[PDB]
Each structure stands twice: as structure tokens, then as C-alpha cells.
Amino acid sequence: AKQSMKAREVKRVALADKYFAKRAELKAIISDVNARWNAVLKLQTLPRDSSPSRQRNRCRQTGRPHGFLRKFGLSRIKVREAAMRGEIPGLKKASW
Amino acid sequence: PRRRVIGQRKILPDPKFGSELLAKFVNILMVDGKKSTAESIVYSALETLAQRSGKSELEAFEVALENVRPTVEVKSRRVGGSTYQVPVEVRPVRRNALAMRWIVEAARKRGDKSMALRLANELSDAAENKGTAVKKREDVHRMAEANKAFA
Amino acid sequence: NQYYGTGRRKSSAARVFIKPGNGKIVINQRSLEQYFGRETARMVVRQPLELVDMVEKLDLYITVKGGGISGQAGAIRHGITRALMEYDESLRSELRKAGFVTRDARQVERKKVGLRKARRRPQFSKR
Amino acid sequence: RIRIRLKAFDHRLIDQATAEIVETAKRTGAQVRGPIPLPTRKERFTVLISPHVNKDARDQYEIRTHLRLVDIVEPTEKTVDALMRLDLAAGVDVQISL
Amino acid sequence: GQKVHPNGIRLGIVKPWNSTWFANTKEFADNLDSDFKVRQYLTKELAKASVSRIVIERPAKSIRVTIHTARPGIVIGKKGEDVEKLRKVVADIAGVPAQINIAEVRKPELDAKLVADSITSQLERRVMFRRAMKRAVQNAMRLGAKGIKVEVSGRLGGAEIARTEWYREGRVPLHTLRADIDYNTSEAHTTYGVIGVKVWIFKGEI
Amino acid sequence: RSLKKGPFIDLHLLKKVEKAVESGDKKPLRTWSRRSTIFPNMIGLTIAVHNGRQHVPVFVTDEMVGHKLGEFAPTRTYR
Amino acid sequence: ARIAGINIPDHKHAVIALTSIYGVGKTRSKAILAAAGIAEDVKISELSEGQIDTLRDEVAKFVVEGDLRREISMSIKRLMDLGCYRGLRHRRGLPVRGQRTKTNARTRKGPRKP
RNA sequence: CCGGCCGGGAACUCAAAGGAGACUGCCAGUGAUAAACUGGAGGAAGGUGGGGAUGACGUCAAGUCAUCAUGGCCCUUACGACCAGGGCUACACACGUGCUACAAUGGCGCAUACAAAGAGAAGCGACCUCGCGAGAGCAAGCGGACCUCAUAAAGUGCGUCGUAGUCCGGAUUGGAGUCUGCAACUCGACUCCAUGAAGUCGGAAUCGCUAGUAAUCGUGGAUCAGAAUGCCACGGUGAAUAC
RNA sequence: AAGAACCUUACCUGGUCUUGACAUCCACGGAAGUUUUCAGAGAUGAGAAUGUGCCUUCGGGAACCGUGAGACAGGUGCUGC
């Protein structure tokens, strides 16, 4: 399921991290004035998916938008399943 | 507390006079866990009540407390017609505690602005037997004599 | 022995260099009267400081580490208890009878899932 | 002066590895400072158990990263020769400074 | 619906962690997904070899994978050709140099993964669930475990109303954490629905 | 409330607005991007904000400079 | 000191009457407080003409009084004349600064009307 | 350098590994010569020490085919898929949760204290300078008991406010820094300067809590370019009453 | 929902489908890619410049790209009774 969003997220990851993140960053620091504007116009003429704003950081085995955790890299249900099965090293239930 | 009642905690004495009674007055009067403000208002009121009364702090508190202690107090036991109030003798801790509670509300009901000053005012009122805490005591006693049920 | 700071209460640990002399409390090379000498509730934290009744001839420099003020007072008190048993063991029984050798293990209960506080539950709608 | 920061998820692996390094320095015969413990990083994750609806019933997980630093006084060439796969435990990550 | 995963409640106490490595916050998810792609591939590739447990250890340069199997011969193949092709594909999934060890699972009926996939295979082959569960508990009680609980669930025997039928022998103390219970599930993809099999096996109190 | 490094304008709108000013004979300009601050070059033009399938035409004046294009344009309806 | 308003200091602070006059804020009040540097809780007898002139020039240098009604009036009026909805939605009186009015914003909407 | 800062020391707080201790163990009474109950000595802890994780056979054909997988059915030049924009943010009213309060046990102004937990590599950002300010530029130390986030907040010592709609804070378009520049109009917050409404402690009813709990006071996390008074943790003072 | 300005994100306008945004083959051509112009709200096109390196027992094999028919996709569509 939700393969459209999978390839959309792959699209904005490859458009942000690979084609750009140097051109966008240089245009951003040109845009903040250091002592109509060319940097604002050229950052518009860059594609919108290049912006790191666009990426919704999403689950790797399923694709749930929510309950994603960056450290484990999967959805909440999937980190429960791998934790209870022992795939995640050091993950034990907390009881303090 | 169906199984077992729990005994009350041992109460520290107050630092100035060594009185668990004055400490219980402090603990009753505090709000939002503010012991510093509570005991400062207590000391200011005890100083003003003592200088107006001409006796010591603990003795003025004792006479005022003795006037706010009730002797008889009703309790809803519903012995007549499933709604009745029965007068029962009140144990000395509940006498002193009801005295302190009726005092601290009588302070709150008094219209003076600073609570140390009105706290000394109805302490002086109880020492002369005319404040609204002793009004509550008279209402409780009149309700006991009104609905006398058992000895 | 040199009578020193021992013991814990809430989140504190005592570092008092209590020593024979006239007791005037100095904190971080600065006076009680400069820090909070005329503060109200200083007296009722200083009363457990005195409550071991070996403060009558003992000068106090107090730099108890960590935690809140009443817990710091309990740490100081517990330290004078443990140091006085280190001095002589006949007065252990009287501090036990008064109840000062007991550490008060009461501590903050933890927050809990589906609840605002340690015990405090959401206001429940019957409907 | 050799500053070795070894970190793992299990304290038994940590103690085995730090005893091995202490054994290596003891085998070469140098003054060894004791392995000090550095504080455990309890990274807590609070994760929903129910796929669809819950707020009150939820379970909490922890990763515990342990840390010791050995801080041996004297390193030597025999230990540098004997370092090659001396640790040999997959659970432990070892960090080195001069 | 309301019972804890036994391996999760015994993970630091009795049962060992399945994957053992240390990665930082920047590489942990990337290693975890690499482990999942290796594990998924080797499971779907040697489900016919009856693998029980896969432990993956990364020393952060290489990968060492141990496959706990009842039948080591089909996992090895001939001359290690199958396991060397496995080693190569594990190397390109992990992206780092690889190594495979084969640890054997003696007494396959005492391993819960093997019993779960055995009952799953029979349920795909339309053997009856009651015979599968009685066979499992009888074989474990013969082979020497202290107890076994077999839960089968859902669409049993082609009925429209799903039901959960549990068969229990011996002692299965789930609430006691000092006990070792290996619990593993399997999923049979039948014609009318999917039949899920859960087995607990109790071997002792550690 | 918004940035001072540069007043933002959409580049397609800037090109079409300067072309409309240079020609002097233009129809309404249809623009879907509603998030542009009005330049003083825009005065003397109707620039159409996107609302619905329907049309909202705005004749921008001397006062409506600092405001964005969609303030004058209603997206929702009510009684 | 009455300038362009209805309020007057009376044995009290200039700043409360000044902020009661619309068209300003309280940074004028804080600035007059910093310019005087004296206790304004004292009696307003011998009210200083220096205070009156500094009050006047501070009001004149900053946004003068009476401009709030001016701003709301031109806002509603120019968008009502031009036919656009920005001044119409200010006439309707519900919050458009970004606020929820589903059950809140009773300060705008007044008493609740069943 | 009167900063442990510097030699030293490991004596203590600590940090974190392994043990010990708390078992009705001892004594007395009650009880059947049992279980147990009630007190006492010892002791930091006393009789589940506190809290947590742990949710039995089952029940509601409770929830999820929107996490996934999956049987049957349907769309498949659309019921797939991309972009701009919009909606999820509206509003006659009604309740459910929480926040700010109606002040004087409180504000407001000067000075002075005492924590814990956590995070950090496109990340945390000191010191200095410029700004009323949000922040800007220069920018060390840092993949961590160092460095940074981060001189907590109630507590205060003196004053002043002694009906004040009070710093209790509501209210469109501005005057602004900052985030991403698809872009702060429909739509973020922030000292915002924007006119200081209401509420002078609240009817029938109703809810949460037996001890560090209630109440109050502040702090950090996760989601995350930003966007909490919600959720997930942490500390301070500290109740009252159980007949 | 542990993050609604776009994204997320399904409901309103333009653009596209026998390989679709997304994998597998069968057939043909081209390295992959980098930098630009113009139209347009824009994945959409229409054009330009440099890279045929990686190699095949070269009877040419690459991760790949573009296109064509078929199988095939795909669905946050319905039934948790």
C-alpha cells in the first residue's frame, strides 16, 4: 500500500539531498543580506521538493506517517514487534 | 477506610514556642504548601494579639482556642425518618482542629486586607467571645440542642 | 575525630564543618545574615539543625550540596547524628528515642501514563 | 595517557572488555589506573501498543548505553602489537584518544 | 489481546538478545534495516530449511550471522556452495564484508519457531488442527520439556465463524520471569483465511 | 510579522506584471499563487486571485501595497 | 495633562490615563516613566509643564492619538468601497488574526445568543 | 586568581559494578497447642517499605481491512497517479479536558539563593559587540560527568501598591526580529505597545486525591525547518481528615 | 496525530495512462548523469551543450535512462459481523 507516497518521499529525499543542499544553502546565505532579489528569485526557480521542509520522515518497513521514531527508523508498531522479538539490540521494557 | 484506620503523623513542635498546637494551627492555615508565609502570618498575629491582650502568645491562643472548641456536635446518622442529625461528643483532637478550622475561615470571612491583622482580630474576638467562629460554635451547639437524639 | 557532614534527605548531601566554637552559620564564605538570615522558614529549617542538641557549643559552616532547603536541613541533622555516634555511642539511644537517626525515605512519586501527575487522573465524564 | 572509551549496551560485555584491556596492560607490566564508570545513558522511548486507539495504555522502552574509560598511564609497543582484534566482542564500541 | 510477549519480558533477564551490535544514533536505524533485509531474505529463502533463530552480530566493520537450524545440511548445501552464495548476498545486502556460521538446533520439537512452522505447514496441507496440536504437545512432553501451550486461532477447518482453540500440557508459567519460555508464532496462508499459530514451551527456571 | 531581507514576489507574477505594465493593453491576469506582496508597479491592474472555480478580480490601488494578494479574496462562504 | 483625549491624571499615574486614551500603547507609558524617573504615585498637584510638553512631543513623535479608529475605519471603508472581503470580514466582527471562533472568541461575539 | 584552581590525597558527596540488609527474624500478649493479629527491642528502612512492569479462563461479534498482512467483492484511459490552490483552522448555540484568573497568603521594583531528568552532528551553541526586545554578526568547546542547551521557579531581605477590574489578562490592521523561502493572506509563535472585555470565588449538579499524596511552584524530552496551555519525564515547599 | 503554511493529505482545477507514481519480464535505442533557454500554476513539454569512460569467453555484460504491445500493476476503495 501507499506506494505513491513511498516514491514521493524517495523523490523529495533525492531532490533535496543529492541535486541540491549546496545550491540551496548558498542561495539561502546569499538571500540573508551580509554587508526582486536574485537569491529569492533563483531559490524560487529551484524545484520545491529540494527543500528539506518537504520530507515527512516516514517508516521504512510499512510507511506510517505517525509514530515514526528517528532513532529506530520504523513505525511504532514495528519497533514494538522487533523489540519484543529481540531484533533491536538493548531495547528492554522500562519499569522505573 | 474499611479495613483499618491509619494513625496521624507525629507533628513537629513550632520553633519559637515548642507547641504542637501552634504547629497544627500553622499546618491548618497554610495554602499551596506555604509554611514560611503561614508561620510568619501566625507570628505577626500572635505578636499583635499578645500586645493588645496583655498576656503571652501561647496563652492568648489557648484562651481563644478554648472559646472556639465546641463541646457537642451533630452527626448525620439518620436515626429518625432516614434523615436525622445526632449530637455526639467530639474527641479533643477534633475539638482543637475544628477550633483552628473555624478560626482560619473566620479570618478569611473577616474583611480586613492583611490576613495577619484579621487573624489577630478574630483571635481577639474569640478571647472576648463575639466573633463569627464562635458564632459557628453557637450554631453547632444550637443544632445539637435542637435535634437532641441520644445522650 | 573531626565532626563532618554526613547523610542524605530528599536530594541533598551534607558538607558541614561543625567544630567547637560560637555557632554562627556561614555559607560559601558568606553569612547567614547576608544570605537569608532574617528569612522566615530559615528558623524552622535551623531547628532540625539544632534538634540534635549538640549545637550549643559548636560553630557551624554549612555548604550542604544539592536538593531543597528542608532536605538540606535533614541532611545536616542526620550528619550531626552519625558524627555524634562516631564520637560516642551512649547517645545513640536518645537520638533513636527522639527519632532523628531515622532517614526519611519519602521521595517524589513518578508521573504515569494516561495521567497528569503521580496519582492525579483526568477528570472523568460519567456520560 | 592512552585514553580508551569503550561503550556497549550490556554491562557484562563491558566488564569483560575492560577486564581484557586491564589484563593486557597488566601483561605488559605498567601502572594501570582503575576503570572508572561514566554515567549510563537511559534513552527512553514511549511507544503506542494499540494500532488504532489508546492514550492511557502504552508501554515504555529503554536503551541503556554503558560507558567506562580505562585511562592507562603507560602505553607501549608490545600492547600496540597485541591490540589486533584484542576486544573481539560485537556488543562493545571502543573509542581511542592519545 | 492482553498478554505480554514472553521474549520481551524476559529479554534482559533470561532470554538473550537476537541481534548484538552497537551503533550510534546516526547508524542504528541503517543497521537495523540492513539486519531486516538480511533476515527477511534468509527467512524467505530458507523457510524450507527449517531455520529457528538468526543472530546477527556486527563488529561495525563486518557482519557475522549465525543461523540456528535443525537440518544443517540443506542450509550448507553441497560443499558450502549454498551457504557461500548466501554469504555473498548477505555481503551485498549489508554492504560490508560478511560471514555465516551454522549452529545446530538439537531437539527441533522443543524449538517454538520450528513447531509453529510445522503446524503452519500442516495447516497449509489441510491436516486437521486438533491432530497438529495433540502431536505437538505429545512430542514435547515425550522429548522432555516441563510444559507446552499451543494456541491455534481463526478460521479453523473452514468455518465462517473464527475460533481460538488452545491445547495445554505441563507447566507454562508466563508470569514468572525467572522461567525460560521460548515463544514463537507462525502464519499459515490458507484458502479461506489466515490461521495463526502461537506456541509456548517451558524448559526450566533459570 | 514577515521578513525584512527581501519583500517576496512570485517570479511569474513579476514577469507578467512588468509585461502588462510595458504593453499597457491587458485583460485580467489569472494567478493561482495568492501569496505575493503587491509592488507599486501593480497599481493600475486587476490581478485575479484564485477562489473556487469562480473569479475574484482585485483592482489593486495605492493603499494595497504592503498586503499580500489573498487578503482581499475570500476562500470560505457563510451566511 | 489632557492632550487629544478624555482621560486625566488625578493623584495617580499619568501612564494609566495615557494608555486609556486610544491611539497609543504602553511603550509610550514606559518611555514617559523612564524620561521622568520619579514616583508618579505622588499627588498630581504642581503637575509639571515639562511633563506636559514631554508627553505631547512623545505622542507627536510616535503614533498620535486617535489613530486606532482611523485605521479600523479606513480598513473597513476601503475594502467595502472596493468590494473585497477583507474589510467585510472585519465588519462581521469574528477573529481573522488566526483565532478559533467555534466556541471561543466570546470577547468579540459578546454575550452568547441562543 | 582564594575559582579545587594546583600539587597531592582518596577521606567523604558522587558515578556505576558486586555483595549485605527486611525474613514476622527475636521477645510479650491474644488466638487451637495452627494460621494470624496487636504492640516492643534492634535497625536507614517492619510487617506487599513506596512506586512500576506483570492484565488468568473468558466477555463485549468492542476497535483496526487508515499500520501491515489477508478471504471475498469492486474500480482499473479510474476508485491508479502529479501539480497549483483550498479544506482539515469556519460558527446560532451546548457539554468533555486543560490553561489565565477574579488579587493583599497577592502583585510591582532592587538584591540574593537552593535541584533533578534529558538532548546534541544539516545538531547544541557559549565569551565579546550591536540592539528596549524577540534576535543579529563574530563564533570557542563538543558525538558528551568536560562544552553547549541552561546566572531554574515558588523561597526570600527591603520598599511601594492599601478596591484595583489589579501586570489577572482578553481585543481586527499595524511596528517588528526569527523559522522555511512553495510561502507566516485563508494559517505559527515571540517583549508583541496596539483601545485592558469578562469574572468581586461561581445554581442544580459533578470530579481528582490517605503522605511526599492532594494543592502549589518551576525545568527538560519526543513530533519536528518552525509551530503546545496536549502528551511523555523531572525536581521544591508541603497539607487537612478518617469517629 | 509523538507537529494541518506546501509536504503530510485522500475531498475542488489543469495536465497522464497499456505501462501508468510504484516492481517483474519481452523487444529496440542510448552511459548514468551535469548545465541552460522558452511556454505554463505546475511532475508537463518543446529545445540546446558535455559525458559513447565502468567493459563483454565483445557472437558485448553493467546499477541505469527513454519508448512500445501484452501479461501486469495499482486502490488511505467496501465488508473487523
Q: In what order do the strands lie in the sheet with F29-30?
A: F29-30, F46-50, F55-59
CA trace torsion F56, F62, F67, F70 (10° rounding): 10
* C85 vs D51: CA distance, rounded Å: 60
Count the residues in chain E: 206
Q: Tell me if residue F56 falls in helix, strand or coil.
A: strand
Amino acid at D92: V
CA D33 / C1′ H7 distance in Å: 19
* B63 vs B59: CA distance, rounded Å: 6
How is chain E split into domains, by residue range?
16-106, 107-206
Please name which of C28, C38, C40 lies closest in space to residue C64, comparing C-alpha atoms. C28
Count the residues in chain B: 151
Q: Tell me if residue D69 falls in helix, strand or coil.
A: strand
The CATH architecture one would assign to domain E107-206 is: 2-Layer Sandwich (3.30)
C25, C43 contact by CB (below 8 A) = no
* B14 vs E54: CA distance, rounded Å: 68
* B70 vs C113: CA distance, rounded Å: 46
Method: cryo-EM
DSSP code, position C117: S
| Vertex E192 angle, CA E189 and E198, to 5° | 45
* Strand pairing class (A91-93; B72-76): unpaired
HEC profile for chain E? CCCCCHHHHCCCCCCCCCEEECCCCCCHHHHHHHHHHHHHHHHHHCHHHCEEEEEEEECCCCCEEEEEECCHHHHHCCCCHHHHHHHHHHHHHHCCCCCEEEEECCCHHHCHHHHHHHHHHHHHCCCCHHHHHHHHHHHHHHHCCCEEEEEEECCCCCCCCCCEEEEEEECCCCCCCCEEEEEEEEEEECCCCEEEEEEEEEEEEC
Residues 59-98 of B with CB under 7 A from strand H: 75, 88, 91, 93-94, 97
* B37 vs G29: CA distance, rounded Å: 34
Q: Do G85 and F72 touch (CB under 8 A)?
A: yes
| Structure resolution, Å | 3.2
Query: Is the alpha carbon torsion for G21, G27, G31, G36 positive or negative?
Result: positive
Please name which of D44, D9, D48, D41 lies closest in space to residue A95, comparing C-alpha atoms. D44
CATH number assigned to the domain covering E16-106: 3.30.300.20
* C83 vs C6: CA distance, rounded Å: 7
Please name which of C26, C82, C23 lies closest in space to residue C57, comparing C-alpha atoms. C23
CA trace torsion D76, D79, D80, D84 (10° rounding): 180
HEC profile for chain G? CCCCCCCCCCCCCHHHHHHHCCCCCCHHHHHHHHHHCCCCCCCCCCCCHHHHHHHHHHHHHCCCCCHHHHHHHHHHHHHHHHCCHHHHHHHHCCCCCCCCCCCCCHHHHCCCCC
Q: Tell me if residue B69 falls in helix, strand or coil.
A: coil
* E182 vs E111: CA distance, rounded Å: 7
CA E47 / C1′ I17 distance in Å: 39
Give me the phi and psi of E132, to 5 degrees please. Answer: -65, -45
DSSP code, position F53: S
* D40 vs B30: CA distance, rounded Å: 41
Give all domains of chain D, ordered by start, each with its CATH number: 1-98 (3.30.70.600)
Q: How many A×E Cβ pairs under 8 Å? A: 56
A contact residues 45-84, partner D, Cβ 8 Å cutoff: 67, 69, 71-72, 76-77, 79-80, 83
| Residues whose CB falls within 8 Å of the CB of residue D51, separated by 6 or more in sequence, listed in order | A77
G contact residues 5-64, partner F, Cβ 8 Å cutoff: none
Q: How far is CA C117 from the centre of its chain?
A: 26
Query: Is the alpha carbon torsion for B104, B109, B112, B114 positive or negative?
Result: positive
Amino acid at C127: R
Among partner residues E9, E25, E32, which is closest to A87 by beta-carbon distance?
A: E32
Q: Tell me if residue F37 falls in helix, strand or coil.
A: strand
Show the cell assigned to B121.
482580630
Buried b (16+ CB within 10 A) or exposed e, E46-78: beebbbbbbbbbbbbeebbbebbbbbeeebbee
Give me the phi and psi of D39, to 5 degrees please. Answer: -75, 145
Residues 27-66 of B with CB under 7 A from strand H: 27-38, 40-41
HEC profile for C69-94? HHHHHHHHHHHHHHHHHHHCCCCHHH
Provide, as residue numbers in chain D, all residues whose Cβ is less than 8 Å from the Cβ of A67.
47-48
Query: Is the alpha carbon torsion for B81, B87, B91, B95 positive or negative?
Result: positive
* Strand pairing class (F29-30; E64-69): unpaired
The DSSP element (H or E) to which D68 belongs, if any, is: strand D59-69
